[PDB]
Structures are given as C-alpha cells and as structure tokens.
C-alpha cells in the first residue's frame, strides 16, 4: 500500500493519545510540583512507566516505513524524529548497566559532603554552607581546601565509572549510526531539509572556536583589570605577569564572577539601582508585580495572557504544610493548561524572574498552534536567550521610570552606566570562555582523540590557555575536576549556553535596530514597539516547524553565526578599561603557578 | 478525571453529505491489508474518545451546540411564531384586522 498517506494517519493517532497523556503526566508533575506529599509519588511511577511504554512502542512501529520516498518535508522530518531508536539498539545487559551506572552517578553525585579535618563530624554539602564559605570569604586556606576537598572526595570516585561510561555512551553512539557521541549531542543543530540553508554536525565543529577570538580582547582586557583589582585587594597572591588561580573567581568553576563584583566594583561610592523600597512603599504584592511586568508585553504586541491563569497556578506563600518547590518554572501542560511555579516574594530579582518566567509562559503560547510533535524550538538556544534578551530590555533605568515607579528628575551619568555594564560582563561575557573550553573538553572525551592518560594534562593546559585559570594545588592523573559539575554527571549538552547568549545579543540589536532606538546598544527600550513584536512572533511561533536557519532570518538580517552586537554591547566598558590597564600587561603566562 | 463518554469520527474512507449520519464502526484500513475486525498493521479503530475536564483550556473544552434547520414543503404549515393583539376599542370609526 502507499507509504505517505498512511504515515500520515499513523501520525495523526500517535498524536491523538500522545497529547492526553502527555497532558495527564504534566499535570500530575505540576500537581506534586505545587502538592508535595507522600502520595503524589506511586501515581507518577504509573504516569511516567506508561509514558515510557508510548514514546517507545509507538516509535517500535516507527520503523516499517521507508523515510526515503516522503516528498512533505514536515512529515519527514516528523517521522525521523519518531524513528529514533534510542538507546534500546544495544543488548539487555548492556542497556541495564548504562541505567546502572547512570544511576548510581547521580545518586553520588547528589551526596556530596566534605568534612572539615579538624571537626571530622561535620561534613557540609554543595549546598550553601561550604559553598557559602567559599563564595563569601577574604582568605586563601580555607577556599583553597574547599576547593580541593569537592574536588577530590566528588572527583575521585567518579572517576572509574566515567572511563566506562565514555566508552558505553560512545558505543551505542556507534549503534546509533553515529561515529561519536559528539555528533550525537550536535545532531539538533543540523538542517537537512531545504536548499541554501544546509548545515551539518561537522559544522558546529568549527563553527563554535572562530566566533571567540574576536571576544578575546576584550576578555583580555577584563582579565587585566581584574588581576589589578586583585593585586590592590589580595597582595602578594596574583602573578601580574601571570593570572589568577581556580578558586579566586568566585565559583569553583569559573563560570560567573558575580561573587566578584563587590571586590572589582568599577565606582563603588555610588550603589546600585534597587527599587525594592518602591515595592515596600507602595505596598505592590505579587498581583501587582505580575500585571505591571504583563503590561511590558501588552505594550509589545504579544498576544494578551490567558484568563483563569491566576486561578490554577500558585504565586506566592506556600505556608502550611502545603508545600510547593520554590524553583520558578513555566510549566505547558497541553490542552490549553500553562501555569507559573515560583515563590513571588519583594525583590528586584523576583521581578527580574518572574520576567523570565513569564516570557518562557508566552514562549509556550508561542507554539500553541504547532502539533504534538512539533511544540518545541528550533533550538535549545531559543527559550533562554527569548527569555533573557527582555528582562535585559526590561532591567533599564528608563523602562523602571516609564512605569511611574522612579522620579522623573534623575541625574544619570556615565558612571552608573558603566557600573552596570561592568556588574553585567562579570557575569555574561566571563562565561563564554568557559563554556567553549569545557564544550570542546566533551566533545574530544566523546570522540576519543586523546587517550586515557591524555585527561587532566590536556584539561588544566588548555583551561590555563583559554580561560588563564592555574592550578591551586597540584593534580594527578585519577583526578577529574570536570566531573564536580552540574552538567557533566547528567549528560547535558553545555553548547546551549554558548549559542543562547550571542542569540540574546543579535535578537537584542534586531529589536533595538527595528524599535525606533539610537544610542549605546546597552540602553535599548523596546517597550510599546508593536512592529517589533511582529519580527519575534514571526519565528516564536514557528517552533520546530522550520529550521534554525531560516530561524536567523526573519529577526536578524543575516543567517551566518556572526558575533556583531557583543562587542558593542560592552563598548563603553572597553573604552573605559582602555583608560584603566594602561600600565598593567594584557593576558597571562602558563608558566607559573600558586604552589611554585 | 477525564469525560469519555464522548466521541468523534476521525478516520473514514469518504466525506459526510449534507444532514448524512453514519454510524458505522468497521475498522479502518489506512493500508491495503484486510483486517478481520481488529486493528493491526495498517487498521485503527475510526473513532476517538474525549478527554474533556474541567482544566481544559478555552477551545478545548466540551460545547453544546444545536441547529435548526426549517422545511417548508407544499404540505400545510403550521410551525410559525406568535403572533400578539391589540385592545378593542368600540364606538369609534377604527380599520381592525380580525
């Protein structure tokens, strides 16, 4: 019989009962995520085993049409998506010691507790505690032992089992039709679909390492600045020549140097904007927050936010024994059902939050219209950066005033605007080096050019290069600092990260560009720009339903992965330090080390 | 939990004509294997049941819709709308509609 007609209604009955229990699941999540008790826990054991045993028969049957004569591109790519096999390619044995070791890595992982030697009673967690000592401290022994004590009672255990876990994950990568489970994790960003727009996983390979270098000055520059900071702070522990070691960041690993603006503060005598006082004042709860953050998209163009939402989700004030998880979600139940999941309380960053949390809400909407199947991004780095790019917009002097929430006499200067866009490159821009050594870490440990032996030398020499981070304290062989990370024991690709950001600023210099704005890209108001809000909801929208390179051009003018707006974003910061490490060397020298 | 008790046609081989009810529940044959009576291959079962609650969403909730459809064949009439009356006035020269 013909192959295309019934795909299609195969598709269409696949979806029918994908989309009630997927809706039944989420709901049940949501329910136990605002519910939490003892008896919301067997009934998603027979949601989550009956979900299980629908996304892979239905995908068993996946398997008897020949994807080779499919003219629809839409069905085509729909029906790949559900011709993944997944990890069932392998024997039984095998597959159930891979969920083995998956599971007793995290479970290890998730029992981190390090003791003090002096009181060997008392282990502390990655919780706050040890991690608050050594983020909030002035002094160089006990950051330095904490460092090497999650290191090394985390990063050694683990160990073992990732020398078997690489080459399991690798082999049914091969079983997979793939040559290395680096393409695995680079097969989402691929196009296979229309002319002019192709790429490949090979692409990403080269695409990732040629957009930095043009970031490396002003990397450079930053980390001289920082370096002197330190010197006029911690005398007599920072090479001048040299950098800084692991633990003086801030983080353990290096990604935010948000603990490090109080000590690298660029003007300290002026503090920051914080209207948490207005709040105070006007009484403005977690009703008023919501609406006057909501009335930022009505203004937008975005289509207006569903009514009896402020009926099932929950807000605020978990109280009693009624307790629900204080991590902000957007949870999409399907069939109509989105819903908020954060603890609302008086704080800038609950605004900040509760606008990204609304954002992935009309992100979710986005897709209403989409299938099933295809109520997804074009890419990971999609969801983040939509979120981010307008609480960046939204975080403005102007855009607080614009609300009647500050005077309209203020007297802002260039000082507090590059205060805040040195609090801001602390964060955003420190952490592309970061994220580019440790995704081309995983992609050479997944693809098996360096050997065993070839793990911690090659690691500490190019984070030295790249980020000019040294090692505290000598290391050996057995140990793996990677592996006291969040990503990293849960097999989560890090590239999102690093895609999402430069998706934020492009995304950001489109709308500024396309929002009757001129000035510093930095100082960009999009508020009450309804042709703007076209250019994202042409693409929001879409969801999966197109590729990512056909994503890049209905917002920003060009499909290629360019890095334009991050070096103009921070170009007052840059012509600023231009004046401030005039007489302090710009970079690092891998030549020296704290211990010698 | 969930209203099952409603149904939908969603796979039949031909279109509906106008004011047309089929109530027939063969299996359908999206392929071209027969089926005795049961789905398999290349056969589902042609109607699908609701899940409607009260959590749905606006459009996806339960709707209860009823059309009138008016005949007016040659045979006499006599489905037609009230018709009201005025109050009699006497001993005054008036134009009455009986």
């Given at each position: 019989?013909?192959?295309?007609?019934?795909?299609?209604?195969?598709?269409?009955?696949?979806?029918?009962?994908?989309?009630?229990?997927?809706?039944?699941?989420?709901?049940?999540?949501?329910?136990?995520?605002?519910?939490?008790?003892?008896?919301?826990?067997?009934?998603?054991?027979?949601?989550?085993?009956?979900?299980?045993?629908?996304?892979?028969?239905?995908?068993?049957?996946?398997?008897?049409?020949?994807?080779?004569?499919?003219?629809?591109?839409?069905?085509?790519?729909?029906?790949?998506?559900?011709?993944?096999?997944?990890?069932?390619?392998?024997?039984?044995?095998?597959?159930?010691?891979?969920?083995?070791?998956?599971?007793?890595?995290?479970?290890?992982?998730?029992?981190?507790?390090?003791?003090?030697?002096?009181?060997?009673?008392?282990?502390?967690?990655?919780?706050?505690?040890?991690?608050?000592?050594?983020?909030?401290?002035?002094?160089?022994?006990?950051?330095?032992?904490?460092?090497?004590?999650?290191?090394?009672?985390?990063?050694?255990?683990?160990?073992?089992?990732?020398?078997?876990?690489?080459?399991?994950?690798?082999?049914?990568?091969?079983?997979?039709?793939?040559?290395?489970?680096?393409?695995?994790?680079?097969?989402?960003?691929?196009?296979?679909?229309?002319?002019?727009?192709?790429?490949?996983?090979?692409?990403?390979?080269?695409?990732?390492?040629?957009?930095?270098?043009?970031?490396?000055?002003?990397?450079?520059?930053?980390?001289?600045?920082?370096?002197?900071?330190?010197?006029?702070?911690?005398?007599?522990?920072?090479?001048?020549?040299?950098?800084?070691?692991?633990?003086?960041?801030?983080?353990?690993?290096?990604?935010?140097?948000?603990?490090?603006?109080?000590?690298?503060?660029?003007?300290?005598?002026?503090?920051?904007?914080?209207?948490?006082?207005?709040?105070?004042?006007?009484?403005?709860?977690?009703?008023?927050?919501?609406?006057?953050?909501?009335?930022?998209?009505?203004?937008?163009?975005?289509?207006?936010?569903?009514?009896?939402?402020?009926?099932?989700?929950?807000?605020?004030?978990?109280?009693?024994?009624?307790?629900?998880?204080?991590?902000?979600?957007?949870?999409?139940?399907?069939?109509?059902?989105?819903?908020?999941?954060?603890?609302?309380?008086?704080?800038?960053?609950?605004?900040?939050?509760?606008?990204?949390?609304?954002?992935?809400?009309?992100?979710?909407?986005?897709?209403?219209?989409?299938?099933?199947?295809?109520?997804?991004?074009?890419?990971?780095?999609?969801?983040?950066?939509?979120?981010?790019?307008?609480?960046?917009?939204?975080?403005?002097?102007?855009?607080?005033?614009?609300?009647?929430?500050?005077?309209?006499?203020?007297?802002?200067?260039?000082?507090?605007?590059?205060?805040?866009?040195?609090?801001?490159?602390?964060?955003?821009?420190?952490?592309?080096?970061?994220?580019?050594?440790?995704?081309?870490?995983?992609?050479?440990?997944?693809?098996?050019?360096?050997?065993?032996?070839?793990?911690?030398?090659?690691?500490?020499?190019?984070?030295?290069?790249?980020?000019?981070?040294?090692?505290?304290?000598?290391?050996?062989?057995?140990?793996?600092?990677?592996?006291?990370?969040?990503?990293?024991?849960?097999?989560?690709?890090?590239?999102?990260?690093?895609?999402?950001?430069?998706?934020?600023?492009?995304?950001?210099?489109?709308?500024?560009?396309?929002?009757?704005?001129?000035?510093?890209?930095?100082?960009?108001?999009?508020?009450?720009?309804?042709?703007?809000?076209?250019?994202?909801?042409?693409?929001?929208?879409?969801?999966?339903?197109?590729?990512?390179?056909?994503?890049?051009?209905?917002?920003?003018?060009?499909?290629?992965?360019?890095?334009?707006?991050?070096?103009?974003?921070?170009?007052?910061?840059?012509?600023?330090?231009?004046?401030?490490?005039?007489?302090?060397?710009?970079?690092?020298?891998?030549?020296?080390?704290?211990?010698? | 939990?969930?209203?099952?008790?409603?149904?939908?046609?969603?796979?039949?081989?031909?279109?509906?004509?106008?004011?047309?009810?089929?109530?027939?529940?063969?299996?359908?044959?999206?392929?071209?294997?027969?089926?005795?009576?049961?789905?398999?291959?290349?056969?589902?079962?042609?109607?699908?049941?609701?899940?409607?609650?009260?959590?749905?969403?606006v459009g996806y909730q339960p709707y209860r819709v009823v059309v009138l459809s008016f005949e007016l064949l040659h045979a006499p009439a006599?489905?037609?709308?009230?018709?009201?009356?005025?109050?009699?006035?006497?001993?005054?020269?008036?134009?009455?509609?009986?």
């Amino acid at each position: 019989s013909t192959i295309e007609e019934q795909a299609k209604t195969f598709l269409d009955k696949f979806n029918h009962e994908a989309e009630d229990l997927f809706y039944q699941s989420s709901l049940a999540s949501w329910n136990y995520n605002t519910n939490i008790t003892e008896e919301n826990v067997q009934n998603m054991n027979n949601a989550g085993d009956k979900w299980s045993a629908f996304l892979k028969e239905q995908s068993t049957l996946a398997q008897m049409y020949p994807l080779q004569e499919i003219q629809n591109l839409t069905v085509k790519l729909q029906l790949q998506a559900l011709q993944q096999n997944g990890s069932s390619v392998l024997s039984e044995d095998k597959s159930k010691r891979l969920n083995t070791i998956l599971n007793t890595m995290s479970t290890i992982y998730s029992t981190g507790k390090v003791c003090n030697p002096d009181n060997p009673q008392e282990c502390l967690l990655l919780e706050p505690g040890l991690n608050e000592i050594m983020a909030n401290s002035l002094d160089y022994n006990e950051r330095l032992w904490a460092w090497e004590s999650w290191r090394s009672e985390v990063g050694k255990q683990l160990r073992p089992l990732y020398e078997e876990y690489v080459v399991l994950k690798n082999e049914m990568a091969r079983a997979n039709h793939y040559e290395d489970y680096g393409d695995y994790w680079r097969g989402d960003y691929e196009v296979n679909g229309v002319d002019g727009y192709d790429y490949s996983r090979g692409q990403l390979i080269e695409d990732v390492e040629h957009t930095f270098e043009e970031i490396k000055p002003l990397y450079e520059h930053l980390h001289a600045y920082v370096r002197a900071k330190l010197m006029n702070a911690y005398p007599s522990y920072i090479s001048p020549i040299g950098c800084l070691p692991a633990h003086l960041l801030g983080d353990m690993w290096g990604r935010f140097w948000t603990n490090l603006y109080s000590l690298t503060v660029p003007f300290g005598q002026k503090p920051n904007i914080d209207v948490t006082d207005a709040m105070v004042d006007q009484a403005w709860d977690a009703q008023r927050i919501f609406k006057e953050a909501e009335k930022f998209f009505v203004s937008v163009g975005l289509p207006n936010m569903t009514q009896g939402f402020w009926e099932n989700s929950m807000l605020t004030d978990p109280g009693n024994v009624q307790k629900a998880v204080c991590h902000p979600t957007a949870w999409d139940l399907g069939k109509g059902d989105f819903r908020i999941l954060m603890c609302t309380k008086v704080t800038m960053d609950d605004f900040l939050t509760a606008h990204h949390e609304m954002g992935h809400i009309q992100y979710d909407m986005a897709y209403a219209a989409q299938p099933f199947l295809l109520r997804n991004g074009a890419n990971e780095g999609f969801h983040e950066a939509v979120g981010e790019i307008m609480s960046l917009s939204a975080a403005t002097p102007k855009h607080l005033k614009s609300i009647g929430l500050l005077s309209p006499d203020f007297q802002e200067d260039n000082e507090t605007e590059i205060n805040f866009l040195l609090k801001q490159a602390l964060t955003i821009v420190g952490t592309l080096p970061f994220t580019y050594m440790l995704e081309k870490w995983r992609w050479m440990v997944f693809k098996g050019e360096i050997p065993k032996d070839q793990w911690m030398k090659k690691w500490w020499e190019m984070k030295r290069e790249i980020v000019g981070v040294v090692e505290p304290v000598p290391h050996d062989e057995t140990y793996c600092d990677p592996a006291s990370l969040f990503h990293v024991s849960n097999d989560y690709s890090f590239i999102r990260y690093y895609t999402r950001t430069l998706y934020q600023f492009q995304f950001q210099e489109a709308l500024c560009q396309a929002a009757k704005h001129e000035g510093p890209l930095h100082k960009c108001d999009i508020s009450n720009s309804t042709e703007a809000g076209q250019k994202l909801f042409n693409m929001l929208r879409l969801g999966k339903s197109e590729p990512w390179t056909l994503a890049l051009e209905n917002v920003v003018g060009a499909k290629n992965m360019n890095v334009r707006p991050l070096l103009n974003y921070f170009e007052p910061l840059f012509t600023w330090l231009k004046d401030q490490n005039k007489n302090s060397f710009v970079g690092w020298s891998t030549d020296w080390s704290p211990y010698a | 939990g969930g209203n099952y008790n409603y149904l939908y046609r969603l796979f039949r081989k031909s279109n509906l004509k106008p004011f047309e009810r089929d109530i027939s529940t063969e299996i359908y044959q999206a392929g071209s294997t027969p089926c005795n009576g049961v789905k398999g291959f290349n056969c589902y079962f042609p109607l699908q049941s609701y899940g409607f609650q009260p959590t749905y969403g606006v459009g996806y909730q339960p709707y209860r819709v009823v059309v009138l459809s008016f005949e007016l064949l040659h045979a006499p009439a006599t489905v037609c709308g009230p018709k009201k009356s005025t109050n009699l006035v006497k001993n005054k020269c008036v134009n009455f509609n009986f």
